[PDB]
Amino acid sequence: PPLPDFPLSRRGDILPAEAERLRAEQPVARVRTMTGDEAWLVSSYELAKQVLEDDRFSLKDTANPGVPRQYALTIPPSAGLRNAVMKTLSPQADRELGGWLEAQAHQLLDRLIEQGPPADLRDGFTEPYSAALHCRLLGIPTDDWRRLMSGIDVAFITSPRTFEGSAVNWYKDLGYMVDRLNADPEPTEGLLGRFAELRRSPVSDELLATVALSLFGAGAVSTSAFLQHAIIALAQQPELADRLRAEPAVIGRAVDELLRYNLSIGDALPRIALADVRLGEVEIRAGELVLVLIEGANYDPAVFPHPERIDFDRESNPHLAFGGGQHFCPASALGRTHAEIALTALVEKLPALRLALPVEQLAWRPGFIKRLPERLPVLW
Amino acid sequence: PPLPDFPLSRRGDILPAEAERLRAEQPVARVRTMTGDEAWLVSSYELAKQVLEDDRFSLKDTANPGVPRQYALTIPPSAGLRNAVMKTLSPQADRELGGWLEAQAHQLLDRLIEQGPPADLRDGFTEPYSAALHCRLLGIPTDDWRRLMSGIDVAFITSPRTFEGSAVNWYKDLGYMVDRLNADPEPTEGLLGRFAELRRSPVSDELLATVALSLFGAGAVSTSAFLQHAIIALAQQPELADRLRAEPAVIGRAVDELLRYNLSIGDALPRIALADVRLGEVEIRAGELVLVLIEGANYDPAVFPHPERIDFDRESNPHLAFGGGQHFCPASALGRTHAEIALTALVEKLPALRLALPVEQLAWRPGFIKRLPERLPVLW
Ligand code: HEM
Ligand code: HEM
């Protein structure tokens, strides 16, 4: 027979029809990835939760030489840092984050209002707003955000084969972090401040900058893409923005539901089976690639009635947008706060927010870890 | 039978196979445009030259209500201005243009060199370099170039139906031109300077700003897109950049050949037949839409041997990249100068210039008047 191909579709404004058929017909299915390797695509909520919470399936080992891949690695080839890192990802270790984020959002939003519609809400909000957040998370200035976000454009490319340029891109920004950490007025504030300190107590510079880089990349790309999907929802269903205006306190339940809904994840969560395991009806052999399809789990009608309709008042919403098990997103609280504040500012300041053209004419980015529109032109 | 669909393909790095079949099989062919109207696609050099030089085929009338369209108009609904305009499009009416352009190019190029590869040559060069040129052409500052280029992103969308937002976008930047022309230190220098003067001699503000807007839009979009295609050629055939380095004076013949080669034109030149005309073997009835396919003419082997191989030493190269007949590009000299200077700077400063990833993985913009890569990541 012919294997279904993976990934599924770049169009991000409706669930891929193929993700619905996979969950219904073959919740665990063999698929051919874009590298040509084969893999197991897990697309039901129960089975997807099982894999994520079972450490016999390993994320660490998906980067070993020789294993099957869904796309080439872009990164080339245990020390009490957890604290430096975990302290930075507690929105409760920076009391001022909330109000500072609100001021950044309104700053960007006010700039667009003076210029008048239309505006591209990716380059005007979401991109600078996600760079600014992560520049502050590290304690480095927002001056270079365009250059840092552009580095993300390359770092998160999904390519069938390794490509020159992902290595050059890695070492180029790695040098940038090194430079900020070793600047003369040694950095205070942020992970880079906690890092300059940690290297006086009684870990290398390369490895420090590595953690700074992957945290900036992983976060700016993920918050910006989700936030563009949230915007598309509010622009298309304006009754949702009315709800937010009338009942501002629902913003927590609403971001939670948009998280379940959103299709910003353009690949699958990868795991390498460390042992033979039985999963649903399929026998998975050690060394094989397993791919968790978050959108299949989060649209599974066994767990989420009317999964295709956004609903802020679900009795229960135990979605997998942040992963699960051991590798559950460490910054989940930070990601919620970031989106809650941005959307609250958006629906106050642009109350007639809508798309400037039919949603079907948005240009969706090919070949990227996230599904995102290249531009997000809106009116208000 | 089923009509071939138009436009042809967004991928811009090789000739669309369908454009070769149309020229060989049906040089004049009925096609269904993206609006659903039908039209005559003229794809041979002789026939395409005929249409362009025959004023019974009318560009003016392609904007009349009711006529067939290849895409909706984005603009909504004879006065001695020709001089103000023609004086601005003579690279010989600004002695300083050459050296100023060279300084802008090297400025942008030096900025990329200090940051190190990879760089996106669309956002780093071509876009700011084409905005700067056209900001100077009008005598307005380069401060807002990002906002002006973003307006181009919407103004030149090809949509099956009119969309809100193209009108708002038009009036929004129309106001910008009006504001620069009616600024307190009334503008000197450029079309806006020649305009503030022309309205003291013994034409309305709306109409003045209209000419400023369409000239900025038509030029920034066309020079930026061609220049990205020229870059892709030099990066892929590095023997061409060696030729330019060794024999700098060939830059005129080389831009001329890249012009013949380039696929930045994503639509066809539209004409409304004012009369019945016989064209090749086809009888065209008055009121019908005729579409000239520049890439078919410029790859026609009847006129250009080995049309698919870039060649700087063709005996003759009478291409149609700039149109022809009455509506031949008024700024053709300006467009050549602009590209010649940019490419000369590019191959001096980035001598190992190449694409950062396989050319087949470039993201090509959908639904736009130009074929262009969304990003152009390179190494050197
Ligand atoms: C709305 C925003 C975000 C969404 C939807 C999201 C989603 C996810 C998901 C699904 C995972 C699990 C991946 C797996 O199991 O393989 C993950 C992992 C991760 N999250 Fe992203 N994320 C967001 C924001 C952030 C932010 C703000 C940061 C950092 C600044 C961050 C840092 C990380 C890191 C480092 C991991 C890897 C954890 C590990 O290796 O165990 N996330 N997140
Ligand atoms: C490499 C750059 C350029 C290329 C390849 C190019 C190409 C063309 C073509 C093919 C036409 C004819 C369209 C038709 O017959 O319907 C045209 C028209 C036109 N060119 Fe663009 N162009 C370039 C640069 C520029 C620049 C720099 C400006 C202005 C700043 C400009 C202004 C115009 C205008 C106003 C028209 C319309 C003329 C009319 O209505 O008769 N061009 N050009």
DSSP B31-84: EE-TTS-EEEEE-SHHHHHHHHT-TTEESGGGGSTTS--SS--SS----SHHHH
DSSP string, B169-194: HHHHHHHHHHHHHT-SS---SHHHHH
Q: How far apart are CA B217 and CA B173, in angstroms?
A: 10
Q: How far apart are CA B179 and CA B184, in angstroms?
A: 9
Residue type, A222: S
The alpha carbon of B215 and the centre of ligand 2 are apart by a number of angstroms equal to: 9
User: Tokens 């996106």 label which residue?
Assistant: B120
Residue type, B72: A
Which one of B34, B163, B362 makes the best mutation probe of the A interface by having the most chain A beta carbons within 10 Å?
A: B163
Q: How far apart are CA A236 and CA B147, in angstroms?
A: 25
Q: How many CB atoms lie within 10 A of CB B188?
A: 11
Nearest CA among B209, A365, A308, A353 for reference residue A374: A365
- Nearest by CB to residue A379, choosing from B161, B168, B361, is B168
Q: How far apart are CA A49 and CA A46, in angstroms?
A: 5
Q: What Å distances lie between residue A267 and B224, B254, B357, CA to CA?
A: 33, 43, 20
The alpha carbon of B327 and the centre of ligand 2 are apart by a number of angstroms equal to: 8
DSSP string, A94-145: -TTHHHHHHHHHHHHHHHHHHH-S-EEHHHHTTHHHHHHHHHHHHT--GGGH
For residues A274 and A56, the answer to whether their CB atoms sit within 8 Å is yes
Q: How many residues are given for chain B?
A: 380
Phi, psi at B156, each rounded to 5° = -110, 20
Separation in Å, CA of B9 to nearest CA in chain A: 15
Nearest CA among A180, A175, A187 for reference residue A151: A175
For residues A154 and A170, the answer to whether their CB atoms sit within 8 Å is no
Q: How many CB atoms lie within 10 A of CB A198?
A: 16
Nearest CA among A236, A279, A219, A247 for reference residue A344: A247
Nearest CA among B115, B327, B330 for reference residue B215: B330
Q: After which residues is chain A broken (C to N over 2.5 A)?
A: 77, 202
User: Tokens 């300006």 label which residue?
Assistant: B334
DSSP string, A184-253: SS---SHHHHHHHHHTT----HHHHHHHHHHHHHHHHHHHHHHHHHHHHHHHH-HHHHHHHHH-GGGHHH
Q: How many CB atoms lie within 10 A of CB A302?
A: 11
For residues A150 and A240, the answer to whether their CB atoms sit within 8 Å is no
DSSP code at position A92? T
Ramachandran area for residue A215 (φ above 0: left; ψ -120 to 50: alpha; else beta): alpha
Encoding tokens for residue B342?
Answer: 């940019």
For residues B187 and B198, the answer to whether their CB atoms sit within 8 Å is no
User: Tokens 């300041």 label which residue?
Assistant: A349
Q: How far apart are CA B23 and CA B21, in angstroms?
A: 6
Beta bridge partners of B269: B292
Encoding tokens for residue B327?
Answer: 């509506």
User: Tokens 């060649």 label which residue?
Assistant: B311
For residues B48 and B265, the answer to whether their CB atoms sit within 8 Å is no
Q: How far apart are CA B41 and CA B48, in angstroms?
A: 9
**Number of H helices and number of E strands within chain A?**
14, 10
Burial zone of A188 (CB within 10 Å; 0-12 exposed, 13-18 middle, 19+ buried)? exposed
Start-to-end CA distance of chain B, whole Å, equals: 51
State the pairing for strand pair A277-279/A282-284.
antiparallel
Encoding tokens for residue A305?
Answer: 């009635």
Which one of A162, A168, A170, A365 makes the best mutation probe of the B interface by having the most chain B beta carbons within 10 Å?
A: A168
The CA-based angle A243-A339-A361, given to 5 degrees, is: 80
The CA-based angle A264-A109-B115, given to 5 degrees, is: 70
Burial A75-88 (b: 16+ CB within 10 A, else e): eeeeeebeebbeeb
Contact B357 A164 (CB under 8 A): yes
Q: Is A59 in the pocket of ligand 1 (CB under 6 A)?
A: yes
Encoding tokens for residue A150?
Answer: 């552009």
For residues B196 and B187, the answer to whether their CB atoms sit within 8 Å is yes
Q: Is A226 in the pocket of ligand 1 (CB under 6 A)?
A: yes
Helix (H, G, I), strand (E, B) or coil at B124: helix
State the pairing for strand pair B269-273/B57-58.
antiparallel
Residue B249's Cα: distance from chain center in Å? 24
Nearest CA among B261, B255, B229 for reference residue B243: B255
Residue B128: list chain A partners with CB under 8 A.
none
For ligand 1, what atom is nearest to the CA of residue A227?
1
For residues A33 and A6, the answer to whether their CB atoms sit within 8 Å is yes
Question: Please, what is the angle between helix B238-246 and helix B332-349, to 10°?
Answer: 100
Helix (H, G, I), strand (E, B) or coil at B4: coil
Q: Residues 6 or more apart from A138 whose CB is under 8 A from it?
A: A88, A177, A180, A190, A191, A192, A212, A215, A216
Phi, psi at A177, each rounded to 5° = -60, -50
Encoding tokens for residue B56?
Answer: 């019974």
For residues B257 and B313, the answer to whether their CB atoms sit within 8 Å is no
Nearest CA to ligand 1 atom 20: A329
Beta bridge partners of A181: none
Contact A165 B366 (CB under 8 A): no
Domain ranges for chain B = 17-379
Q: How far apart are CA A280 and CA B298, in angstroms?
A: 59
CATH of domain B17-379: 1.10.630.10
Q: Mark out the alpha helices in chain B (DSSP H runs).
A: 17-25, 45-52, 81-88, 97-115, 121-124, 127-138, 145-155, 166-181, 190-198, 205-236, 238-246, 251-261, 294-298, 332-349
DSSP string, A52-70: HT-TTEESGGGGSTTS--S
Q: Mark out the alpha helices in A237-319 (DSSP H runs).
A: 238-246, 251-261, 294-298
For ligand 1, what atom is nearest to the CA of residue A336?
1
For residues B24 and B380, the answer to whether their CB atoms sit within 8 Å is no
Nearest CA among B319, B121, B351 for reference residue B240: B351
Nearest CA to ligand 1 atom 9: A322
Q: Residues 6 or more apart from B155 whose CB is under 8 A from it?
A: B74, B75, B166, B169, B170, B173, B217
For residues A196 and A187, the answer to whether their CB atoms sit within 8 Å is yes
DSSP code at position B221? H
Q: Is A327 in the pocket of ligand 1 (CB under 6 A)?
A: yes
Burial A305-340 (b: 16+ CB within 10 A, else e): eebeebbbebeebebbbbbbbeeebbbeebbbbbbb
Nearest CA among B355, B337, B282, B297 for reference residue B95: B337
User: Tokens 């990833």 label which residue?
Assistant: B357
Closest residue on chain B to A170 (Cα) = B118
The alpha carbon of B324 and the centre of ligand 1 are apart by a number of angstroms equal to: 56
Contact B164 A356 (CB under 8 A): yes
Encoding tokens for residue B227?
Answer: 């220049």
Q: How far apart are CA B10 and CA B7, in angstroms?
A: 8
For residues A42 and A56, the answer to whether their CB atoms sit within 8 Å is no
Q: How many CB atoms lie within 10 A of CB A380?
A: 18
Residues framing ligand 2 (Cβ under 6 A): B 59, 137, 215, 218-219, 222-223, 226, 269, 321-323, 327, 329-331, 334-335, 339
The CA-based angle B130-B123-B246, given to 5 degrees, is: 70
Q: How far apart are CA B112 and CA B125, in angstroms?
A: 9
Q: How far apart are CA B265 and CA B12, in angstroms?
A: 9
For residues B258 and B233, the answer to whether their CB atoms sit within 8 Å is yes
Nearest CA among A111, A51, A6 for reference residue A350: A111
Beta bridge partners of A364: A373
- Nearest by CB to residue A172, choosing from B117, B166, B365, is B117
Separation in Å, CA of B49 to nearest CA in chain A: 34
DSSP code at position B5? B
Which one of B74, B120, B360 makes the best mutation probe of the A interface by having the most chain A beta carbons within 10 Å?
A: B120
- Nearest by CB to residue A164, choosing from B119, B161, B356, is B356
Residue B318's Cα: distance from chain center in Å? 18
> Determination method here?
X-ray
Half-sphere exposure of A261 (CA within 13 A, CB side): 23
Q: How far apart are CA A212 and CA A229, in angstroms?
A: 26
Question: Please, what is the angle between helix B332-349 and helix B97-115, to 10°?
Answer: 40
CA-based R_g, chain A, Å: 21
Encoding tokens for residue A308?
Answer: 């295709």
For residues B324 and B49, the answer to whether their CB atoms sit within 8 Å is yes
Encoding tokens for residue B355?
Answer: 């694409």
For residues B286 and B274, the answer to whether their CB atoms sit within 8 Å is yes
